[PDB]
Design a protein around this ligand. Structure first.
Ligand SMILES: *[C@@H]1O[C@H](CO)[C@@H](O)[C@H](O)[C@H]1NC(C)=O
Ligand SMILES: *[C@@H]1O[C@H](CO)[C@@H](O)[C@H](O)[C@H]1NC(C)=O
Ligand SMILES: *[C@@H]1O[C@H](CO)[C@@H](O)[C@H](O)[C@H]1NC(C)=O
Ligand SMILES: *[C@@H]1O[C@H](CO)[C@@H](O)[C@H](O)[C@H]1NC(C)=O
Ligand SMILES: *[C@@H]1O[C@H](CO)[C@@H](O)[C@H](O)[C@H]1NC(C)=O
Ligand SMILES: *[C@@H]1O[C@H](CO)[C@@H](O)[C@H](O)[C@H]1NC(C)=O
Ligand SMILES: *[C@@H]1O[C@H](CO)[C@@H](O)[C@H](O)[C@H]1NC(C)=O
Ligand SMILES: *[C@@H]1O[C@H](CO)[C@@H](O)[C@H](O)[C@H]1NC(C)=O
Ligand SMILES: *[C@@H]1O[C@H](CO)[C@@H](O)[C@H](O)[C@H]1NC(C)=O
Lengths: 142, 226, 294, 327, 98, 49, 42
């Protein structure tokens, strides 16, 4: 009786460090992408996570991530960066996005979905050029 | 060991290349034989591995024989759970053994033995079918699987690879982009055993049930329960 | 010193071996790099050619504990040139020689009170025929009552003689010379057996081991198997009826001439005690790299 | 105080992810088809059935962990491996072209015997791993083909050559590896024009940095030793079956067939009882050890997924996250 | 027993689902036998069968190796009152080998 | 413990030198804790830091 | 090495002045040098 109680306490102990690490990780989870919205890849939610939800349970915690998942991938033509031939130091680097040529000509699209929209200063930065960039002089952003 | 009638079918050559049993006058078990040149000390004839298993033997004619032992078929059987399709898989072996020479207790062929040679080995109970299922949850080793589908037999399939959308790398300043044009909201749900049920018990009821002779005898170990 | 890492003196395993594996194994092992019980064999005195008085040691009255067997190195100093033991002014070549063994569980005093007398049945081993024969008997020794005999008057010590002009000549071997040399002092009673062994003679140094246990006395020699290597390989099993607790070495002398006294090697004896080694067997199966645990 | 000389050192880190999914049998391993053992194993029963169901569940946990980490490393979009990748960068050892050269020399350098996945019985026929029946257990072929793994490695390799520019784990805009690592060096805080007046010098020091390790793959590099230590721990796990048959634990002999061929029923009852308790306790401790290593492998594989998600497909932010100092 | 009860040898099951049960029980059964090591002559146990049986304090022992033993010609010349064996068996006089 | 028959292993590195590490860290966190980078040293006065 | 126990241990050619903060050393020699790349921490 007592040595299967020894065993019982011993495996209770094992589940105790298991649940201690589990509780540490779980409170980390409810901190990172539940309170704020962190930028880790799959660390709390599979796929590109957006929103998370937390519910208690009589032996732990259940977590609900709802996140964007892509579909219908198609080929378009983007760019890397546009700098003037006469003024190489002026470049536009899209903040969290990519280029497109549609000519409704260079315009902006996000990093997730086919959402083209024209070149705006509000979602780009200025960085020094490199040897492998693109030059144009016929139609330029403000 | 005591003597026996020998005849021809007792030599190493009489059972070369066969999964047989061996009795090297006390060193007994089940072994295989393969013809090999003189390895190790000739005078010993009893050479063991790092884990106390005979690895060879010098025969009387001077031919050495590697003892790789009577390794069986590498045994597996699969059953598609509670859809009545179960069939057996033989790891990395030809179909040189068939549904005749078994033992154990028995084996049920059900309907109608029959080679299903595959990269995992030799399968019995399947039929060849070049099927490609990516999301299958019934793997058969390496890249082998089976189709759930919707009184017959069970068909073969492969663990398919979902090829990514291929985009050609361009050394030119122009480049081609691969973009998703449709979006969804996948739900990833997880559970964490943050709290265990906080269960306790004492030594006088679980271990003693309040019996007085038990109560006085329990104090000999005493502080153990404490 | 005897170096186990230099593959010096490792007993071959009894009934199982390995190949290219490193593994530990218990057993009976000596101590690494010992002084041993070094004895040398020197020829007797000579005045020209005629047979004269001996030239031997008090090693006939010195004893060491058998423990759990002992091992003997043969010809380690041979194939060289050193001073002759009896003639310090003479420097001659060094030739391998083989030792005679006496074994029993009792040590007592001789007729003159010197210790070394053995009671009951005694195990006697003797090389003979210029070392070709390996005569032995677990039988009863009987000293005689003559002059300079262990049961007779004027007793000093004991040894064995050798006349190689009559023994080590072409063929001959002089009616097992060395056995009758030991029997020139002794007689045999209540005897059990007489075993001979057939060993060639060369000038390549070798190992030897002797032990006893509940399944008898066992003798290990490398002459039968490994020459270019060398490990104590089991060759002889002797039907003993008890356990032996003491061992000693019979000194040996030679009826040499005075002018061309050729000396012999100083052989070494090492005791065996329960221990474990580590053995690194290569693919050949010969013991070429082993080491102690203690 | 800022240094005027810089090199690229190479840090080598190995993390064990997947224990070989070994399975062991109530029937064949324990009993080996002996009739008294056949009629005595059943009243024990639930013990070995519970532990083999437990190892089945742990193996399935490992399998689903492997599936999850593949789902993590499966890039939605990828680029084919091109001849002359990197331009001036002679990255010939890293390229995959069935099997990649670097992992091939890692396979050769690490002391690995072939686990007979295609002609294992034939390998036993012509000439350790073959002792899989001799001790008695069965490890499955892995969840993936070697080409399935090759596709995964090529996919992640193609992805990280392009996703080192801009966040967003959906679209792929693969940069050439040159311009990619120029922008990476801009990310770590080095301006472009010093790199841009020294293309050949930075390329040459980059190539000697990437040629350093296969010359340095020896006893000095601790990562190769810990790979071999993981392999040796798997070897000790299988030895914990192999030697323990010989470990009598108060029994007589390892050969259960010789046990039953010798011993009479009124004493082989107690002897086979000693056998079964010794073997059941050893397997209990065994499955305990690899279940502990199972959650260890789960957390380690999660951390490895994080490591390939942070300093492989992006620019890291933790100080010395995966490299000694400035990775 | 058959193939499917062998799967369901621990619990009870039902109709239609997906699930892997790679647990198994069979083996590739032997079909051959070898009984040599080299050769062997018979060790004479007549020295036990002859001679004066000595006292208990002077028991006489004989060892046998590298030979043959035939128990069929030995116990036929015996009248055994009792035959017990601590952690070995009386039935293993000539079946297993050491 | 030697009476008990075992030996705890001592610190293989001295107390004053982990003190030196902790002092170095106290100096360092001002330098690194203003702009990202691990190369140089940027010791702000700790008031302003 | 006077009041010892157990079985055996030996020493090569020359109990030097080796009084260190860890304790006392046998088989070394006094030399205070700087190692910034120590791999075998004494
Ligand atoms: C299974 O069928 C396909 C298509 O006929 C064939 O290519 C393949 O070789 C077959 N498998 C075997 C093992 O023959
Ligand atoms: C996106 O895919 C889902 C999948 O069924 C579909 O229901 C939906 O209509 C699609 N949306 C667009 C805009 O194509
Ligand atoms: C013996 O072991 C060594 C050490 O690994 C190895 O290099 C050698 O190839 C082995 N011998 C054979 C014949 O394989
Ligand atoms: C050899 O020694 C034996 C003693 O055992 C003796 O009987 C025999 O005569 C000797 N040989 C010769 C040729 O004399
Ligand atoms: C041999 O010695 C034993 C031991 O005392 C003795 O019993 C026996 O009679 C002796 N044999 C003789 C004297 O022939
Ligand atoms: C012993 O050796 C001699 C050497 O000439 C040989 O003639 C003789 O046949 C050998 N005898 C045995 C029994 O080996
Ligand atoms: C940096 O040091 C290395 C190693 O000595 C040397 O080869 C290289 O030229 C140095 N670079 C500069 C810029 O000093
Ligand atoms: C690239 O590296 C490989 C391996 O070191 C070498 O064989 C090859 O010649 C190299 N090529 C160039 C162009 O440097
Ligand atoms: C070594 O010598 C110096 C100078 O005399 C002394 O300060 C130091 O304590 C010595 N070290 C040891 C270990 O004795």
């Amino acid at each position: 009786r007592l040595t299967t109680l020894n065993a019982f306490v011993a495996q209770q102990l094992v589940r105790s460090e298991s649940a201690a690490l589990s509780a540490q990780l779980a409170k980390d989870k409810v901190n990172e992408c539940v309170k704020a919205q962190s930028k880790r890849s799959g660390f709390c939610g599979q796929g590109t996570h957006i929103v998370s939800f937390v519910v208690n349970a009589p032996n732990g915690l259940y977590f609900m991530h709802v996140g964007y998942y892509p579909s219908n991938h198609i080929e378009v033509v983007s760019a890397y960066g546009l700098c003037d031939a006469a003024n190489p130091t002026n470049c536009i680097a899209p903040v969290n996005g990519y280029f497109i040529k549609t000519n409704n000509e260079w315009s902006y699209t996000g990093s997730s979905f086919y959402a083209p929209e024209p070149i705006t200063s509000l979602n780009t930065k200025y960085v020094a050029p490199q040897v492998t960039y693109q030059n144009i002089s016929t139609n330029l952003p403000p | 060991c005591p003597k026996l009638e020998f005849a021809n079918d007792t030599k190493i050559a009489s059972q070369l290349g066969n999964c047989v049993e061996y009795s090297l006058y006390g060193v007994s078990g089940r072994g295989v034989f393969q013809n090999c040149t003189a390895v190790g000390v000739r005078q010993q004839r009893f050479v063991y591995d790092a884990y106390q298993n005979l690895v060879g033997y010098y025969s009387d004619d001077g031919n050495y024989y590697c003892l790789r032992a009577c390794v069986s078929v590498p045994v597996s059987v699969i059953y598609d759970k509670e859809t009545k399709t179960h069939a057996t898989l033989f790891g990395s072996v030809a179909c040189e053994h068939i549904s005749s020479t078994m033992s154990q207790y028995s084996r049920s062929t059900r309907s109608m033995y029959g080679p299903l040679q595959t990269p995992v080995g030799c399968v019995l109970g399947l039929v060849n079918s070049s099927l490609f299922v990516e999301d299958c949850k019934l793997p058969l080793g390496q890249s082998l699987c089976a189709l759930p589908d919707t009184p017959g037999e069970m068909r073969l399939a492969s663990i398919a690879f979902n090829h990514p959308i291929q985009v050609d790398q361009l050394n030119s300043s122009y480049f081609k982009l691969s973009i998703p044009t449709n979006f969804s909201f996948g739900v990833t749900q997880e559970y964490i055993q943050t709290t265990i049920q906080k269960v306790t018990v004492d030594c006088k009821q679980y271990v003693c049930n309040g019996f007085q002779k038990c109560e006085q005898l329990l104090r000999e170990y005493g502080q153990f329960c404490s | 010193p005897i170096d186990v890492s230099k593959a010096d003196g490792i007993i071959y395993p009894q009934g199982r071996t390995y190949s290219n594996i490193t593994i530990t194994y218990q057993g009976l092992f000596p101590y690494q790099g010992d002084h041993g019980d070094m004895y040398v064999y020197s020829a007797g005195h000579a005045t020209g050619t005629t047979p004269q008085k001996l030239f031997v040691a008090n090693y006939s009255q010195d004893v060491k504990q058998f423990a759990n067997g002992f091992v003997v190195r043969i010809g380690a100093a041979a194939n060289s040139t050193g001073t002759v033991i009896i003639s310090p002014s003479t420097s001659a070549t060094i030739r391998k020689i083989y030792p005679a063994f006496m074994l029993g569980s009792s040590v007592g005093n001789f007729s003159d009170g010197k210790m070394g007398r053995f009671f009951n049945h005694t195990l006697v081993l003797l090389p003979d025929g210029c070392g070709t024969l390996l005569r032995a008997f677990y039988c009863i020794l009987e000293p005689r009552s003559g002059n300079h005999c262990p049961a007779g008057n004027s007793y000093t010590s004991f040894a064995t003689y050798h006349t190689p002009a009559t023994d080590c000549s072409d063929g001959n071997y002089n009616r097992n010379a060395s056995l009758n040399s030991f029997k020139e002092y002794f007689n045999l009673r209540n005897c059990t057996f007489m075993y001979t062994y057939n060993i060639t003679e060369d000038e390549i140094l070798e190992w030897f081991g002797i032990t006893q246990t509940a399944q008898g006395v066992h003798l290990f020699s490398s002459r039968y198997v490994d020459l270019y290597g060398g490990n104590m390989f089991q060759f002889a099993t002797l039907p003993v009826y008890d356990t032996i607790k003491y061992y000693s070495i019979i000194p040996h002398s030679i009826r040499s001439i005075q002018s061309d006294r050729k000396a012999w090697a100083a052989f070494y004896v090492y005791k065996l005690q329960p221990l474990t080694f580590l053995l690194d067997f290569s693919v050949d199966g010969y013991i070429r790299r082993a080491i102690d645990c203690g | 105080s800022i240094p005027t000389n810089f090199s690229f050192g190479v840090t080598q880190e190995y993390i064990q992810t997947t224990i070989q999914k070994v399975t062991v049998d109530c029937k064949q391993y324990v009993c080996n088809g002996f009739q008294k053992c056949e009629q005595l194993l059943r009243e024990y029963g639930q013990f070995c059935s519970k532990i083999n169901q437990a190892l089945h569940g742990a193996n399935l946990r490992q399998d689903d962990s492997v599936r999850n980490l593949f789902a993590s490393v499966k890039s939605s979009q990828s680029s084919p491996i091109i001849p002359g990748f990197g331009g001036d960068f002679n990255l010939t050892l890293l390229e995959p072209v069935a099997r990649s050269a670097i992992e091939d020399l890692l396979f050769d350098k690490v002391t690995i015997a072939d686990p007979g996945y295609m002609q294992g019985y034939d390998d036993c026929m012509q000439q350790l791993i073959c002792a899989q029946y001799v001790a008695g257990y069965k490890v499955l072929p892995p969840l993936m083909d070697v080409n399935m793994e090759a596709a995964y490695t090529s996919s992640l390799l193609g992805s990280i050559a392009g996703v080192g520019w801009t966040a967003g784990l959906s679209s792929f805009a693969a940069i050439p590896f040159a311009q990619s690592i120029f922008y990476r060096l801009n990310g770590v805080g080095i301006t472009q024009q010093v790199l841009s007046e020294n293309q050949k010098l930075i390329a040459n020091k980059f190539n000697q940095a990437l040629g350093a390790m296969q010359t340095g793959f020896t006893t000095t590099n601790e990562a190769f030793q810990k790979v071999q230590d993981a392999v040796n721990n798997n070897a000790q796990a299988l030895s914990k079956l192999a030697s323990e048959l010989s470990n009598t634990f108060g029994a007589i002999s390892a050969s259960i067939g010789d046990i039953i061929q010798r011993l009479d029923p009124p004493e082989q009852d107690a002897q086979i009882d000693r056998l079964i308790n010794g073997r059941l306790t050893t397997l209990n401790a065994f499955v305990a050890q690899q279940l502990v290593r199972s959650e260890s492998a789960a957390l380690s594989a999660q951390l490895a997924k994080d490591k390939v998600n942070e300093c492989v497909k992006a620019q890291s932010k933790r100080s010395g996250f995966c490299g000694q100092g400035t990775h | 027993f058959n193939d499917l009860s062998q799967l369901h040898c621990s619990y009870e099951s039902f109709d239609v689902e997906s699930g892997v049960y790679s647990v198994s029980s069979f083996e590739a059964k032997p079909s051959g036998s070898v009984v040599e090591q080299a050769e062997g002559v018979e060790c004479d146990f007549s020295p036990l069968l002859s001679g004066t049986p000595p006292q208990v304090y002077n028991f006489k022992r004989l060892v046998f190796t590298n030979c043959n033993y035939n128990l069929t010609k030995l116990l036929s010349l015996f009248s055994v009152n009792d035959f017990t064996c601590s952690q070995i068996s009386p039935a293993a006089i000539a079946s297993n080998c050491y």
